[PDB]
Structure formats: C-alpha cells, structure tokens
Amino acid sequence: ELDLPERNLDRRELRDLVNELAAHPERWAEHVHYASLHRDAYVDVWLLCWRAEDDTGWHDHDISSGAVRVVAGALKECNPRIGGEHLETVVSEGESFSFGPDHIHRLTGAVHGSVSIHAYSPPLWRLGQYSIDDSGVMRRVSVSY
Ligand SMILES: C[N+](C)(C)[C@@H](Cc1c[nH]c(=S)[nH]1)C(=O)O
Ligand SMILES: [Ca+2]
Ligand SMILES: [Mg+2]
Ligand code: NI
Numbered sequence: 001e002l003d004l005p006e007r008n009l010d011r012r013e014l015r016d017l018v019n020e021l022a023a024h025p026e027r028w029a030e031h032v033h034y035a036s037l038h039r040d041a042y043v044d045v046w047l048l049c050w051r052a053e054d055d056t057g058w059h060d061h062d063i064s065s066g067a068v069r070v071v072a073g074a075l076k077e078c079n080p081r082i083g084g085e086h087l088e089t090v091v092s093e094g095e096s097f098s099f100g101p102d103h104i105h106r107l108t109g110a111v112h113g114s115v116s117i118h119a120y121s122p123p124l125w126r127l128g129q130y131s132i133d134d135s136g137v138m139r140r141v142s143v144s145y
Contacts, residue, residue, distance in 0.1 A: 001037070002021075002027065002037055002038040002045060004017070004040075004042070005042070007042055008043075008121045009043060009119070010065060010121075011065050011066075011067065011098040011099065012098065014043075014065060014119045014120070014121055015067040015096055015097070015098040017043075017045070018045075018068060018069035018096055018117045018119050019096050021037070021069070021117050021119075022071045028117065031047050032047070032049060032115060033048070033049040033050075034046050034048045034049070037117075039123065041122075042121055043119060044118075044119065044121075044123045044124045045118070045119045046117070046118045046119075047115065047117055048115070048117075048118060049114070049115055050075060050110030050111070050112070050113070050115070051110070051113075052109075052111070052112045054107075054108065055106070055107075055108040056106050056107045057106055057131075058078075058080055058104060058129070058130040059104070059105070059106065059127050059129045059130065060101075060102075060103060060104045060128040060130075060140075061103065061120060061128075062126040062127060062142070063126075064101055064120040064121065064123065064125075065098070065099065065100050065121055066098065066099055066103070066119060066121075067096060067098040067118070067119050068091070068098075068116055068117070069096035069116060069117045070091050070093050070095055070096070070114065070115070071093060071115040071117060072093050072113065072114060072115040073093055073110060073113060073114025073115060073116075074092040074093065074114060075107055075108070075109060075110040075111070075116065076088045076089065076090055076107065076109035076110075077089045077091050077107060078105060078106040078107070078108065079104070080106075088109075125144065126144055127142070127143045128141070128143070129141045129143055
C-alpha cells in the first residue's frame, strides 16, 4: 500500500495526493484495466489505464470527496445539466482536479493508453450510477465498491 495519514483527506489534500503520486512512478509503474494502490478506512487510490471506448457513465461518489490526476494522455470530465446539454472539459496530462461529495460527473473520451490516478476520501465504498429509461426518467442505483 501507500503510507498515508490515518484520517480523512479533504479535496485539496486529495489533489495534492494524486499529483505527488504522479511524481513517484515507483508507486504505480508496475501496475501499468485498473489497479488499487491503497485501500484503508480513510483513503482509496486507484490507477486507471484507459481505452478509447471507456466510459464511467454518470455517477456520484455518495459521501466521498475525490481528486483526479491525468498522468499520460487526456480525458473528458463531463458535468450534467438539466436541460441535457452537458458540459465537457478536456483534462490533459499533468493536469488535475478535485471535487466534494456532491459531485456528479462522467469520465470518457480518453486518449487510448491514457493513465490517471484517482483518490477518494472517505473511501469509495458506495457509488451512485444514474440511468435513463425509455421515457427519459432518471434513476440512481447505489452500487457497493
Ligand atoms: C477503479 N474502480 C474502482 C473500479 C472505479 C473507479 C472510477 C473510475 N472512474 C471514476 S470517476 N471512478 C471504476 O473504474 O469504476
Ligand atoms: Ca497518450
Ligand atoms: Mg516531492
Ligand atoms: Ni467519479
């Protein structure tokens, strides 16, 4: 695992975490499709390797805050809008962002071979996945992780 604090990390601390981890390839190069780098009572960290078709779908992280750092490549951070015309932001290698627990988003459109580091605190034990039925009606399925 990683040698992290024995407490929850907030948004800025998770962002610091994913960015410093990207600077320490000894922590993750071997795991270069996902690999856990660390799971305890306070923090989850994953390494994700992306194919072009990968798509998280729309989801929240329940009570988890989180942060993402793109190590190689680029992907789209998408935010949902009620009208239906969703925001898309390309996040490129070297760049990172963070979010509190109210965040709903979707990650897709990755460059093939992209690599990112994701950290969540409290741990990512539940995730809400949104879906739309035939009539356009939205639901949230809470998934254990
Ligand atoms: C690696 N993982 C735990 C299996 C998750 C984590 C995840 C990927 N993207 C976002 S946002 N969260 C996933 O790939 O769904
Ligand atoms: Ca690339
Ligand atoms: Mg350093
Ligand atoms: Ni997410």
